[PDB]
Design a protein around this nucleic acid. Structure first.
Ligand SMILES: [Mg+2]
Ligand SMILES: [Mg+2]
Ligand SMILES: [Mg+2]
Ligand SMILES: [Mg+2]
Ligand SMILES: [Mg+2]
Ligand SMILES: [Mg+2]
Ligand SMILES: [Mg+2]
Ligand SMILES: [Mg+2]
Ligand SMILES: [Mg+2]
Ligand SMILES: [Mg+2]
Ligand SMILES: [Mg+2]
Ligand SMILES: [Mg+2]
Ligand SMILES: [Mg+2]
Ligand SMILES: [Mg+2]
Ligand SMILES: [Mg+2]
Ligand SMILES: [Mg+2]
Ligand SMILES: [Mg+2]
Ligand SMILES: [Mg+2]
Ligand SMILES: [Mg+2]
Ligand SMILES: [Mg+2]
Ligand SMILES: [Mg+2]
Ligand SMILES: [Mg+2]
Ligand SMILES: [Mg+2]
Ligand SMILES: [Mg+2]
Ligand SMILES: [Mg+2]
Ligand SMILES: [Mg+2]
Ligand SMILES: [Mg+2]
Ligand SMILES: [Mg+2]
Ligand SMILES: [Mg+2]
Ligand SMILES: [Mg+2]
Ligand SMILES: [Mg+2]
Ligand SMILES: [Mg+2]
Ligand SMILES: [Mg+2]
Ligand SMILES: [Mg+2]
Ligand SMILES: [Mg+2]
Ligand SMILES: [Mg+2]
Ligand SMILES: [Mg+2]
Ligand SMILES: [Mg+2]
Ligand SMILES: [Mg+2]
Ligand SMILES: [Mg+2]
Ligand SMILES: [Mg+2]
Ligand SMILES: [Mg+2]
Ligand SMILES: [Mg+2]
Ligand SMILES: [Mg+2]
Ligand SMILES: [Mg+2]
Ligand SMILES: [Mg+2]
Ligand SMILES: [Mg+2]
Ligand SMILES: [Mg+2]
Ligand SMILES: [Mg+2]
Ligand SMILES: [Mg+2]
Ligand SMILES: [Mg+2]
Ligand SMILES: [Mg+2]
Ligand SMILES: [Mg+2]
Ligand SMILES: [Mg+2]
Ligand SMILES: [Mg+2]
Ligand SMILES: [Mg+2]
Ligand SMILES: [Mg+2]
Ligand SMILES: [Mg+2]
Ligand SMILES: [Mg+2]
Ligand SMILES: [Mg+2]
Ligand SMILES: [Mg+2]
Ligand SMILES: [Mg+2]
Ligand SMILES: [Mg+2]
Ligand SMILES: [Mg+2]
Ligand SMILES: [Mg+2]
Ligand SMILES: [Mg+2]
Ligand SMILES: [Mg+2]
Ligand SMILES: [Mg+2]
Ligand SMILES: [Mg+2]
Ligand SMILES: [Mg+2]
Ligand SMILES: [Mg+2]
Ligand SMILES: [Mg+2]
Ligand SMILES: [Mg+2]
Ligand SMILES: [Mg+2]
Ligand SMILES: [Mg+2]
Ligand SMILES: [Mg+2]
Ligand SMILES: [Mg+2]
Ligand SMILES: [Mg+2]
Ligand SMILES: [Mg+2]
Ligand SMILES: [Mg+2]
Ligand SMILES: [Mg+2]
Ligand SMILES: [Mg+2]
Ligand SMILES: [Mg+2]
Ligand SMILES: [Mg+2]
Ligand SMILES: [Mg+2]
Ligand SMILES: [Mg+2]
Ligand SMILES: [Mg+2]
Ligand SMILES: [Mg+2]
Ligand SMILES: [Mg+2]
Ligand SMILES: [Mg+2]
Ligand SMILES: [Mg+2]
Ligand SMILES: [Mg+2]
Ligand SMILES: [Mg+2]
Ligand SMILES: [Mg+2]
Ligand SMILES: [Mg+2]
Ligand SMILES: [Mg+2]
Ligand SMILES: [Mg+2]
Ligand SMILES: [Mg+2]
Ligand SMILES: [Mg+2]
Ligand SMILES: [Mg+2]
Ligand SMILES: [Mg+2]
Ligand SMILES: [Mg+2]
Ligand SMILES: [Mg+2]
Ligand SMILES: [Mg+2]
Ligand SMILES: [Mg+2]
Ligand SMILES: [Mg+2]
Ligand SMILES: [Mg+2]
Ligand SMILES: [Mg+2]
Ligand SMILES: [Mg+2]
Ligand SMILES: [Mg+2]
Ligand SMILES: [Mg+2]
Ligand SMILES: [Mg+2]
Ligand SMILES: [Mg+2]
Ligand SMILES: [Mg+2]
Ligand SMILES: [Mg+2]
Ligand SMILES: [Mg+2]
Ligand SMILES: [Mg+2]
Ligand SMILES: [Mg+2]
Ligand SMILES: [Mg+2]
Ligand SMILES: [Mg+2]
Ligand SMILES: [Mg+2]
Ligand SMILES: [Mg+2]
Ligand SMILES: [Mg+2]
Ligand SMILES: [Mg+2]
Ligand SMILES: [Mg+2]
Ligand SMILES: [Mg+2]
Ligand SMILES: [Mg+2]
Ligand SMILES: [Mg+2]
Ligand SMILES: [Mg+2]
Ligand SMILES: [Mg+2]
Ligand SMILES: [Mg+2]
Ligand SMILES: [Mg+2]
Ligand SMILES: [Mg+2]
Ligand SMILES: [Mg+2]
Ligand SMILES: [Mg+2]
Ligand SMILES: [Mg+2]
Ligand SMILES: [Mg+2]
Ligand SMILES: [Mg+2]
Ligand SMILES: [Mg+2]
Ligand SMILES: [Mg+2]
Ligand SMILES: [Mg+2]
Ligand SMILES: [Mg+2]
Ligand SMILES: [Mg+2]
Ligand SMILES: [Mg+2]
Ligand SMILES: [Mg+2]
Ligand SMILES: [Mg+2]
Ligand SMILES: [Mg+2]
Ligand SMILES: [Mg+2]
Ligand SMILES: [Mg+2]
Ligand SMILES: [Mg+2]
Ligand SMILES: [Mg+2]
Ligand SMILES: [Mg+2]
Ligand SMILES: [Mg+2]
Ligand SMILES: [Mg+2]
Ligand SMILES: [Mg+2]
Ligand SMILES: [Mg+2]
Ligand SMILES: [Mg+2]
Ligand SMILES: [Mg+2]
Ligand SMILES: [Mg+2]
Ligand SMILES: [Mg+2]
Ligand SMILES: [Mg+2]
Ligand SMILES: [Mg+2]
Ligand SMILES: [Mg+2]
Ligand SMILES: [Mg+2]
Ligand SMILES: [Mg+2]
Ligand SMILES: [Mg+2]
Ligand SMILES: [Mg+2]
Ligand SMILES: [Mg+2]
Ligand SMILES: [Mg+2]
Ligand SMILES: [Mg+2]
Ligand SMILES: [Mg+2]
Ligand SMILES: [Mg+2]
Ligand SMILES: [Mg+2]
Ligand SMILES: [Mg+2]
Ligand SMILES: [Mg+2]
Ligand SMILES: [Mg+2]
Ligand SMILES: [Mg+2]
Ligand SMILES: [Mg+2]
Ligand SMILES: [Mg+2]
Ligand SMILES: [Mg+2]
Ligand SMILES: [Mg+2]
Ligand SMILES: [Mg+2]
Ligand SMILES: [Mg+2]
Ligand SMILES: [Mg+2]
Ligand SMILES: [Mg+2]
Ligand SMILES: [Mg+2]
Ligand SMILES: [Mg+2]
Ligand SMILES: [Mg+2]
Ligand SMILES: [Mg+2]
Ligand SMILES: [Mg+2]
Ligand SMILES: [Mg+2]
Ligand SMILES: [Mg+2]
Ligand SMILES: [Mg+2]
Ligand SMILES: [Mg+2]
Ligand SMILES: [Mg+2]
Ligand SMILES: [Mg+2]
Ligand SMILES: [Mg+2]
Ligand SMILES: [Mg+2]
Ligand SMILES: [Mg+2]
Ligand SMILES: [Mg+2]
Ligand SMILES: [Mg+2]
Ligand SMILES: [Mg+2]
Ligand SMILES: [Mg+2]
Ligand SMILES: [Mg+2]
Ligand SMILES: [Mg+2]
Ligand SMILES: [Mg+2]
Ligand SMILES: [Mg+2]
Ligand SMILES: [Mg+2]
Ligand SMILES: [Mg+2]
Ligand SMILES: [Mg+2]
Ligand SMILES: [Mg+2]
Ligand SMILES: [Mg+2]
Ligand SMILES: [Mg+2]
Ligand SMILES: [Mg+2]
Ligand SMILES: [Mg+2]
Ligand SMILES: [Mg+2]
Ligand SMILES: [Mg+2]
Ligand SMILES: [Mg+2]
Ligand SMILES: [Mg+2]
Ligand SMILES: [Mg+2]
Ligand SMILES: [Mg+2]
Ligand SMILES: [Mg+2]
Ligand SMILES: [Zn+2]
Lengths: 107, 149, 14, 49, 64
RNA sequence: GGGGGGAACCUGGGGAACUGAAACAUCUCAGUACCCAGAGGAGAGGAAAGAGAAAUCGACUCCCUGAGUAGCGGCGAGCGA
RNA sequence: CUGUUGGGAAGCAGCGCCAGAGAGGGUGAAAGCCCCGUAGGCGAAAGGUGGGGGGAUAGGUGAGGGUACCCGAGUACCCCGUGGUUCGUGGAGCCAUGGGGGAAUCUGGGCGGACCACCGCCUAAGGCUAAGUACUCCGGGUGACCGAUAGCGCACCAGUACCGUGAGGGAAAGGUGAAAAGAACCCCGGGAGGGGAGUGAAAUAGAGCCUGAAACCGUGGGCUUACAAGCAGUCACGGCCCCGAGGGGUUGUGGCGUGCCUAUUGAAGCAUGAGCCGGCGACUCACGGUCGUGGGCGAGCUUAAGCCGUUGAGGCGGAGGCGUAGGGAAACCGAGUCCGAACAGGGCGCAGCGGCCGCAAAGUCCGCGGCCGUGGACCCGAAACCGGGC
RNA sequence: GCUGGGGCUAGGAGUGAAAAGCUAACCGAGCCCGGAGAUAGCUGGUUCUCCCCGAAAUGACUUUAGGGUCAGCCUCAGGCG
RNA sequence: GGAUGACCCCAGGCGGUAGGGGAGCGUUCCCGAUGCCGAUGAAGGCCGACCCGCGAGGGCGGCUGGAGGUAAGGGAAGUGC
RNA sequence: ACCCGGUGAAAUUGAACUGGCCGUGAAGAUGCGGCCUACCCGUGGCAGGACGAAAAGACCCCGUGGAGCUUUACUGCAGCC
């Protein structure tokens, strides 16, 4: 039906494990099918590019590698801590993700 | 007493005999079967309880005897089972067939007959038959037989 | 292989 | 027999929960020490009479 | 499946209380005119099968 | 309204042989394998012209038991309420 | 949450916290608290179901007294030929029915094992009827189930490739790494392939990719061999090379020496099988029996199907079975019985250890083991027979 | 007479100027799938180690003779001594 | 002998096919296990002239390997070529 | 056919370090004994041996195996009376 992404494009997340543990950055892109996310400036890898149009002189380019979506915790826009997401039901009937440490919404 | 301590007594769980698993076993190769007979084959011999190699067997050369019965089968008649006095020694007051089924002495569906082996006791004994001996012992001891029918 | 060529007959040791 | 007490105790790695109608020897031997209701000791005493 | 009783055995043989196998003497179904009295008399009796044959037949009577 | 299909299961119409009987024909294998018709989510059966000895029971189906008993049988191998 | 090793922490250390949730799977290694979950709850406009709860409808229902009107016809019934039943012609009933004959309407008819009488049971020749039962194409749960020669034929684009006119037959083939970061660019080369550079913790992890055994092929080195007779080794001593009063490798001379398996009276045998290596490959299971054995209980022992509970908890259930008495074809009698006229003879039968309590035991239930019967029953192999199709 | 195209006849059956010839590269009874893991008293094969004992190739009977039943001979357990 | 494998002493037996019997090794799996061994390196591989065992085997060490393995005591079998 | 360049099979194969004679041996020995002979490895040729290869001997016997055929063998069935 859907792959459970606790994290969405655009919100600020903390990388909690691996060579980049501690880093903080915005979710640039969520790849559900692979259960992974790209975090800005995290998981930098060198990639060989053939000499061609768009890459004359060729060589290598810096690219941001995908991170297992489990290695990522959203930073709460209110209390500023990393946190698990809860589900709060508005009176409207809608449902938003809400931080657990404090109580703020993360949209 | 913990699980690591739970243990069958010596000799309660014997190991099995495995044939056809090598020369050291003493049971390998021919698998304790000898060489090359009907009996060595899979399927083996005919019923070694009856078959005698083709000749007339020692059971089938014996004569039959008595009525074997015929269709439509058994004839329903009253069946009697005996109970000796020495069996009744455990009861007091009265004895009936219905009471002796529960002791496990008289089968169900059989009629009660008391027999003479033992010592009679001053008891009320209700039963479908009595021995010549059981009657004499029972009277001479103060008991009361009650031939029902 | 699927097909067996027939073997030669024997010499008639009769 | 108390459902609430077996609820409270179930999740602990060191506690095997059991109703009295359920007392078997394997569970008794699996465990180091035994703890019973007076109500449950009544059932154990009944089933060995 | 459970064993069946051998019915030839049940019609020729009885298992005594201690487990001896008892049968009728053979030899006086017919041809009896020129036989002795000692002969028919004695052949009217039962006899106790030899041990090795008795134990074969007892295996044929599994529910006696 | 029918027609055709559906893995097994079900009922009906037909229906082998190897094999076993240490040969073989009655017997066995077996009303099995299989062919055909029909049916359905089940089918079959079913409300006594019953059982069978109890002066009893109370439709049918299915399980346990009765029982390898009663019996059947070149009274053989076996078959079997 | 933090620190620490590390490419990576979930490992280790320190201080905490949840639990009706410590089933399980993931995440860079080994995580209750990171992720997906789990316990516990919640949920349908629409379609399907609805055996439960409710309502409706169809439908249903008395006595005597008279009367003798009806009560299932090519039917019952008898006979001939068969089938079904445990019943194979048997004393052969019953149920069925192809052929002939052929009724009656309750004072009628059928049955209780030929037949007759008596006492009984039941009302044929129209139909329908849920539930408890079977099965598994299909969905889900769970394994003292498999783990790529296994498990389905198929983990993979398999009922395919391929074979066959056709019915039909019928494979092989999984795995880089945490992440493609899947090697820009340079060098030799037509390419293929390689050498550098670069990535990675690791590149004999480089895609002909995890581990990477063996047969088999090669390169390098140590010892050795061109006057020598050999199931190839073994024992001895000596030489050389290696490792540090010893050991390893090699083998020059001397001694001894008829492969393995199978089958056989007897094989090195010139009798069988095997090129060599890897993997697959043959005494089991169920029910019954018979001994033995470890226990439980013991003139007693034991439950089956089921029912309740559990959700890897157990209990109920005594129907029934084995045993407590044997003898006889049986009637029958019974510690006796059978043959017999017999009080005759004979056959088959009958009777714990201590100090009222204890040990033990008839027996029986369960476990285990050997062996037996029934099944394909230790595994592989016919030539054939039969059925339905092509 | 030979030959193309279109057709009919088949498994205990066809067809045969007759050879038991031919019926899809082996026909004294086609092929496939199934019964089926037919049956095989025959041949072959039967996988780790150590310790104790240790046979027989005879008799009787057998549509039996290279297979069996009983006995003889081996082994284990318990008893007697 | 000491006191019922606690080790010692003396004496004797110990060729072996069919076959009987005894005691053990190892493989897969279950309980032991919410445990314990494990990246300071699991299983598997390759060596070893070392240690234990009569033997089947088990250790230990080095290399390889890179994520599993599993004790004492028992339980069950698709268990050794 | 032979030599050089290119491509490159096969049945078979326990392993082999695979000689003669006279003996021996399961009765026809490269493999055992005693002698005799014999430096190491090939190439083109011949076919005496390797009881050479191939085909689980068709003959023959054995199996209470099979199939075709026959008849005044047995017992049935069709058909016909
Ligand atoms: Mg959601
Ligand atoms: Mg909404
Ligand atoms: Mg066992
Ligand atoms: Mg053993
Ligand atoms: Mg074993
Ligand atoms: Mg062995
Ligand atoms: Mg042996
Ligand atoms: Mg054998
Ligand atoms: Mg045997
Ligand atoms: Mg043999
Ligand atoms: Mg032999
Ligand atoms: Mg023999
Ligand atoms: Mg053999
Ligand atoms: Mg022989
Ligand atoms: Mg034999
Ligand atoms: Mg024998
Ligand atoms: Mg067979
Ligand atoms: Mg056989
Ligand atoms: Mg005979
Ligand atoms: Mg007679
Ligand atoms: Mg009888
Ligand atoms: Mg050939
Ligand atoms: Mg729990
Ligand atoms: Mg717990
Ligand atoms: Mg625990
Ligand atoms: Mg008979
Ligand atoms: Mg008798
Ligand atoms: Mg007579
Ligand atoms: Mg005379
Ligand atoms: Mg006289
Ligand atoms: Mg006379
Ligand atoms: Mg007389
Ligand atoms: Mg019985
Ligand atoms: Mg239809
Ligand atoms: Mg039918
Ligand atoms: Mg049918
Ligand atoms: Mg037919
Ligand atoms: Mg036939
Ligand atoms: Mg027949
Ligand atoms: Mg036949
Ligand atoms: Mg069969
Ligand atoms: Mg036969
Ligand atoms: Mg036969
Ligand atoms: Mg025959
Ligand atoms: Mg039949
Ligand atoms: Mg249909
Ligand atoms: Mg249903
Ligand atoms: Mg129904
Ligand atoms: Mg009906
Ligand atoms: Mg009616
Ligand atoms: Mg029969
Ligand atoms: Mg039948
Ligand atoms: Mg670091
Ligand atoms: Mg950390
Ligand atoms: Mg800690
Ligand atoms: Mg867990
Ligand atoms: Mg749980
Ligand atoms: Mg851990
Ligand atoms: Mg783990
Ligand atoms: Mg976890
Ligand atoms: Mg986990
Ligand atoms: Mg729930
Ligand atoms: Mg839930
Ligand atoms: Mg009238
Ligand atoms: Mg009739
Ligand atoms: Mg009949
Ligand atoms: Mg009949
Ligand atoms: Mg008949
Ligand atoms: Mg009769
Ligand atoms: Mg009849
Ligand atoms: Mg009639
Ligand atoms: Mg009739
Ligand atoms: Mg009729
Ligand atoms: Mg009347
Ligand atoms: Mg009448
Ligand atoms: Mg009638
Ligand atoms: Mg009746
Ligand atoms: Mg009548
Ligand atoms: Mg009736
Ligand atoms: Mg009527
Ligand atoms: Mg009616
Ligand atoms: Mg119906
Ligand atoms: Mg029903
Ligand atoms: Mg469906
Ligand atoms: Mg399923
Ligand atoms: Mg499934
Ligand atoms: Mg696994
Ligand atoms: Mg594979
Ligand atoms: Mg496969
Ligand atoms: Mg593999
Ligand atoms: Mg395998
Ligand atoms: Mg496998
Ligand atoms: Mg495959
Ligand atoms: Mg599939
Ligand atoms: Mg393909
Ligand atoms: Mg083709
Ligand atoms: Mg084609
Ligand atoms: Mg197929
Ligand atoms: Mg991978
Ligand atoms: Mg991958
Ligand atoms: Mg990694
Ligand atoms: Mg160039
Ligand atoms: Mg290149
Ligand atoms: Mg290069
Ligand atoms: Mg390169
Ligand atoms: Mg490292
Ligand atoms: Mg490597
Ligand atoms: Mg690697
Ligand atoms: Mg890997
Ligand atoms: Mg590799
Ligand atoms: Mg390689
Ligand atoms: Mg070299
Ligand atoms: Mg010289
Ligand atoms: Mg020299
Ligand atoms: Mg030599
Ligand atoms: Mg010397
Ligand atoms: Mg040296
Ligand atoms: Mg030396
Ligand atoms: Mg030498
Ligand atoms: Mg060998
Ligand atoms: Mg031979
Ligand atoms: Mg020979
Ligand atoms: Mg030789
Ligand atoms: Mg040779
Ligand atoms: Mg040879
Ligand atoms: Mg031979
Ligand atoms: Mg061989
Ligand atoms: Mg070959
Ligand atoms: Mg080789
Ligand atoms: Mg091999
Ligand atoms: Mg066995
Ligand atoms: Mg047993
Ligand atoms: Mg037992
Ligand atoms: Mg008990
Ligand atoms: Mg006791
Ligand atoms: Mg009980
Ligand atoms: Mg007497
Ligand atoms: Mg008399
Ligand atoms: Mg006496
Ligand atoms: Mg006992
Ligand atoms: Mg036995
Ligand atoms: Mg079978
Ligand atoms: Mg079998
Ligand atoms: Mg067996
Ligand atoms: Mg076969
Ligand atoms: Mg025939
Ligand atoms: Mg035929
Ligand atoms: Mg046919
Ligand atoms: Mg046909
Ligand atoms: Mg023309
Ligand atoms: Mg033409
Ligand atoms: Mg044409
Ligand atoms: Mg024609
Ligand atoms: Mg035709
Ligand atoms: Mg036609
Ligand atoms: Mg046709
Ligand atoms: Mg034919
Ligand atoms: Mg035919
Ligand atoms: Mg014809
Ligand atoms: Mg012509
Ligand atoms: Mg064809
Ligand atoms: Mg042809
Ligand atoms: Mg043909
Ligand atoms: Mg078929
Ligand atoms: Mg069959
Ligand atoms: Mg079979
Ligand atoms: Mg046969
Ligand atoms: Mg000896
Ligand atoms: Mg002899
Ligand atoms: Mg003969
Ligand atoms: Mg002879
Ligand atoms: Mg024979
Ligand atoms: Mg014997
Ligand atoms: Mg003796
Ligand atoms: Mg003996
Ligand atoms: Mg000694
Ligand atoms: Mg020995
Ligand atoms: Mg073991
Ligand atoms: Mg566990
Ligand atoms: Mg640790
Ligand atoms: Mg590391
Ligand atoms: Mg290492
Ligand atoms: Mg292991
Ligand atoms: Mg493993
Ligand atoms: Mg080792
Ligand atoms: Mg290792
Ligand atoms: Mg793991
Ligand atoms: Mg384990
Ligand atoms: Mg263990
Ligand atoms: Mg245990
Ligand atoms: Mg196996
Ligand atoms: Mg030249
Ligand atoms: Mg050339
Ligand atoms: Mg080429
Ligand atoms: Mg080749
Ligand atoms: Mg050599
Ligand atoms: Mg030479
Ligand atoms: Mg000679
Ligand atoms: Mg000579
Ligand atoms: Mg010679
Ligand atoms: Mg020579
Ligand atoms: Mg030699
Ligand atoms: Mg010699
Ligand atoms: Mg020589
Ligand atoms: Mg010589
Ligand atoms: Mg010479
Ligand atoms: Mg040459
Ligand atoms: Mg030559
Ligand atoms: Mg030659
Ligand atoms: Mg020649
Ligand atoms: Mg040859
Ligand atoms: Mg053959
Ligand atoms: Mg031959
Ligand atoms: Mg031949
Ligand atoms: Mg001959
Ligand atoms: Mg012949
Ligand atoms: Mg004959
Ligand atoms: Mg014969
Ligand atoms: Mg014949
Ligand atoms: Mg034929
Ligand atoms: Mg024939
Ligand atoms: Mg006609
Ligand atoms: Zn917050």
């Amino acid at each position: 039906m859907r792959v459970k992404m606790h994290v969405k494009k655009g919100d600020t997340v903390l990388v909690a494990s691996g060579k980049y543990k501690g880093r903080v950055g915005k979710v640039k892109e969520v790849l559900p099918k692979k259960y992974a996310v790209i975090v800005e400036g995290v998981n930098i890898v060198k990639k060989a590019v053939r000499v061609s149009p768009k890459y004359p002189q060729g060589g290598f380019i810096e690219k941001e590698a995908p991170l297992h979506a489990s290695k990522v915790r959203p930073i709460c826009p209110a209390c500023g801590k990393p946190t698990r997401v809860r589900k709060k039901f508005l009176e409207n009937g809608k449902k938003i993700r809400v931080c657990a440490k404090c109580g703020g919404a993360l949209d | 007493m913990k699980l690591s301590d739970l243990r069958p007594n010596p000799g309660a769980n014997k190991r099995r005999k495995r044939v056809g698993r090598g020369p050291g076993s003493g049971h390998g190769k021919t698998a304790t079967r000898g060489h090359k007979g009907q009996k060595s084959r899979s399927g083996g011999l005919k019923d070694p309880r009856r078959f005698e190699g083709g000749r007339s067997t020692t059971l089938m050369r014996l004569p039959k005897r008595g009525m074997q019965g015929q269709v439509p089968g058994e004839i329903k008649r009253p069946r009697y089972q005996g109970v000796n006095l020495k069996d009744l020694a455990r009861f007091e007051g009265e004895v009936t067939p219905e009471l002796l089924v529960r002791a496990g002495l008289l089968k169900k569906g059989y009629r009660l007959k008391i027999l003479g082996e033992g010592e009679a006791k001053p008891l009320k004994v209700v039963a479908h038959a009595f021995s010549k001996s059981a009657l004499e012992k029972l009277k001479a001891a103060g008991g009361e037989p009650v031939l029902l029918e | 292989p699927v097909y067996i060529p027939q073997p030669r007959p024997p010499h008639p040791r009769l | 027999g108390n459902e609430l007490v077996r609820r409270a105790a179930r999740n602990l790695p060191w506690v095997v929960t059991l109703a009295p109608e359920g007392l078997n020897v394997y569970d008794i031997v699996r465990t180091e020490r035994l703890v019973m209701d007076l109500d449950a000791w009544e059932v154990f005493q009944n089933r060995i009479g | 499946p459970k064993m069946k009783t051998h019915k030839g055995a049940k019609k020729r043989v009885k298992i005594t209380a201690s487990g001896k196998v008892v049968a009728m003497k053979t030899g006086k179904r017919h041809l009896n005119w020129q036989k002795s009295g000692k002969e028919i008399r004695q052949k009217g009796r039962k006899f106790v099968l030899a041990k090795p044959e008795a134990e074969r037949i007892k295996l044929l009577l599994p529910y006696e």
